[PDB]
Write a protein that binds this ligand. Sequence first.
Ligand SMILES: CC(C)(C)OC(=O)N[C@H](C(=O)NO)c1ccc(-c2cc(F)c(F)c(F)c2)cc1
Ligand SMILES: [Mg+2]
Ligand SMILES: [Mg+2]
Ligand SMILES: [Mg+2]
Ligand SMILES: [Zn+2]
Length: 888
Amino acid sequence: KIHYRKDYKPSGFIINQVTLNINIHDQETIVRSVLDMDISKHNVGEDLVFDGVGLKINEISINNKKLVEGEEYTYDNEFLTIFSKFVPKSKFAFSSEVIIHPETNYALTGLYKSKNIIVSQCEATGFRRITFFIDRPDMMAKYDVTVTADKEKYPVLLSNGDKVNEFEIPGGRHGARFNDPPLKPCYLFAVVAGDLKHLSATYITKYTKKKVELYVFSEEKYVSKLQWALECLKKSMAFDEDYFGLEYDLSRLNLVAVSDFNVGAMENKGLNIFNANSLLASKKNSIDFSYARILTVVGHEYFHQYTGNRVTLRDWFQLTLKEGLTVHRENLFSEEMTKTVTTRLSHVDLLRSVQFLEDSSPLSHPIRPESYVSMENFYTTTVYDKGSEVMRMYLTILGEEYYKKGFDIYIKKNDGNTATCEDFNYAMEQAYKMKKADNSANLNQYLLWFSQSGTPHVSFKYNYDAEKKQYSIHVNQYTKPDENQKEKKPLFIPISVGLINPENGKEMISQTTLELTKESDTFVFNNIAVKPIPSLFRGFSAPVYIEDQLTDEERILLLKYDSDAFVRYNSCTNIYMKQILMNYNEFLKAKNEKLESFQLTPVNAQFIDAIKYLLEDPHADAGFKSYIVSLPQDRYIINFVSNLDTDVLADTKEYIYKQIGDKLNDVYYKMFKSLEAKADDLTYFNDESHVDFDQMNMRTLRNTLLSLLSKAQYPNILNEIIEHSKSPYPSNWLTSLSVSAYFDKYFELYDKTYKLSKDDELLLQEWLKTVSRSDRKDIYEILKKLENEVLKDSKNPNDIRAVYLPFTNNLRRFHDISGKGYKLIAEVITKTDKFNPMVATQLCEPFKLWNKLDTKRQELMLNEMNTMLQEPQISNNLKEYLLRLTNK
Ligand SMILES: CC(C)(C)OC(=O)N[C@H](C(=O)NO)c1ccc(-c2cc(F)c(F)c(F)c2)cc1
Ligand SMILES: [Mg+2]
Ligand SMILES: [Mg+2]
Ligand SMILES: [Mg+2]
Ligand SMILES: [Zn+2]
């Protein structure tokens, strides 16, 4: 069935109260539910239809009168239909008892068992897997929930709201009752049972001085990995108070880590549930990336308490209103917490690779789609990450003061209610009116950001009149037509700009945001004393393809002297791309024409000199440095090449890296050595509350340089690699494994690092990733070893994603012209689809670019997708996804 956004209509029913009784046993879980219901003003005498998937019915009733199957109701394992003649015309009670079995629920939706923890996941439509309901977010109800279980196995019982009773039960059981009076949609319901251990703290809110209890839970083995999470939660609460003036409204907040989770985490009210890899960390057992990851995910689920939980969604088409907005809120938070420019750079880096790829694929959709089939496939980088950039542009346009005003208007007006993207734009518009000082102003055009798919292209031409001291920036925007709009309308594009004096590097104008609202415009500046170099889209101010039309000379000057990290980083990116495209074509022609000899355009020497200049600058940022010595991501590059031959691209990258290494390897080595003291400083190694994002960026830089030096076979670098493997930091000794791929000691470090990793569940997964991404010619043989010795038949999504996804980024090997890499991943997708369709669809990610490759590889990928589509037992999720991806 296809759901269309235009078809939204309120229910003919109301659910006012939910009373749950969840009885957990070894071989089954019994769920008793009483729904206190009413007839709505929209009711037209229709049948009462509940969602209910995979439920085993013991009995159902209306007003304590048992209903009988066939006569008064039908159930088809998806919908419970109660014929209208048996539906009361006023307030009534529907009750039911069903059996479900979390033990065998490997799809990790609804109620399921993760190791020895019983946990729910109800977003988007998982509650219907637990009991009958009108499973949609505009059905707001009160919840009274009792959980019972064997006490020895499940001593900790959690649900939403206040725990209002604890009690013993004959036969070694207990129960706990939780009452949550505020209305909520069912996707925010959660329940957890297990032998959980915790850390806790008390937080006192800023304005009302309410005491909030904070609890972070895990299995006993990993309780020592809980501290950073608790710190991140405190940080999150403070930020929402300090930036947005928003306090937590409940007595208690629980964070719970489970080993089996489809995504990073879930914002269930008062009971946030996490993939263990996004909550747990220790400096001995985690790589550096875990620390920013936990900060991000804890912050994200916390900021949902307002943007998603207190202000909720009318329908699922509004998903970006809570996800784009909460990602934006988490980005503000993380940028403030890390104080490094690489935080913003890493987001943009992700958007322009992964999200830009999606938006030019057959899967392209606006951040508010017009239709869906599978809600489990709806949670896309477009909705999230382009969503966040669309939410961030409001702040760019309004500035901090008026943005905060608009945001607070949004919260005060919609608190405790459902909302739509329009409601948010409305609130922002009010601020916009105030800022520009006339109620004539509006943001009507801004709405196109929600409805129009595809990535806009923004291009530039310049003019300078030396005599007039007059400078002009001519701007053009265009979006390519696609399956969603035949004609693309001009968007409201805010362009943050500076003008750099090339002679002294100084700023020539104050902060300026150009408001491009037409297909094209000319922006003129007077009293510009000398010809500037324009600094365009500072902070990456709009989610677009920037075509700056600058010379490499200008870009080099920006890279060295501009004030904005993104524009510096983009100027470097643009220099690299021009080189890549040129060398790519040179290699391609040599291949196509089978040339015995040919020439390659060398890398710009002044560019190499600029890299050396920045690398040697003691005051420059280590994280920024690691970006400039890295070529743009493959998935960013592919946006710019038709019929991309991945082998030719691999040769192109190789040539360009070798060119730069031949000049800078001695600089690289020197820095690798000089950075060690501060990068690997052990002073705070046993203090889990002390996280230094600069220090971690130094380690990133070292590990990046070590990688470059190892590939280059720099003289005696293997010595450094071996010493690096003795480092206490997993980022370092896991790095030592992947860079040793180019030496005969690879399998020695393989075993060494495996032994270090094997007794921590999450570290072992990082080890798996490191092996998976190792640049090995025998990588297929290595993967088979992983399968037989470590992965086996694990249904843990973390294990499966760790073993295979990094490998799919191996440009040379995954895309082997035999198609064997395509064959391998499709075998994994099909296998995984039997028990977890959501994760199987995640494992399809490599195929998203299939129609962008050379015609041979297109054919190879398409063959594997058609093979998958032909599987008799294909899930709804996977079928729908592959049908859209192959334009069927
Ligand atoms: C990495 C971030 C923090 C951005 O996102 C997540 O970790 N999780 C998503 C989110 O927005 N959390 O607040 C998230 C949460 C649940 C789902 C989700 C999970 C399921 F099991 C589904 F079946 C489903 F349809 C959606 C998808 C994404
Ligand atoms: Mg404070
Ligand atoms: Mg100094
Ligand atoms: Mg396991
Ligand atoms: Zn979210």
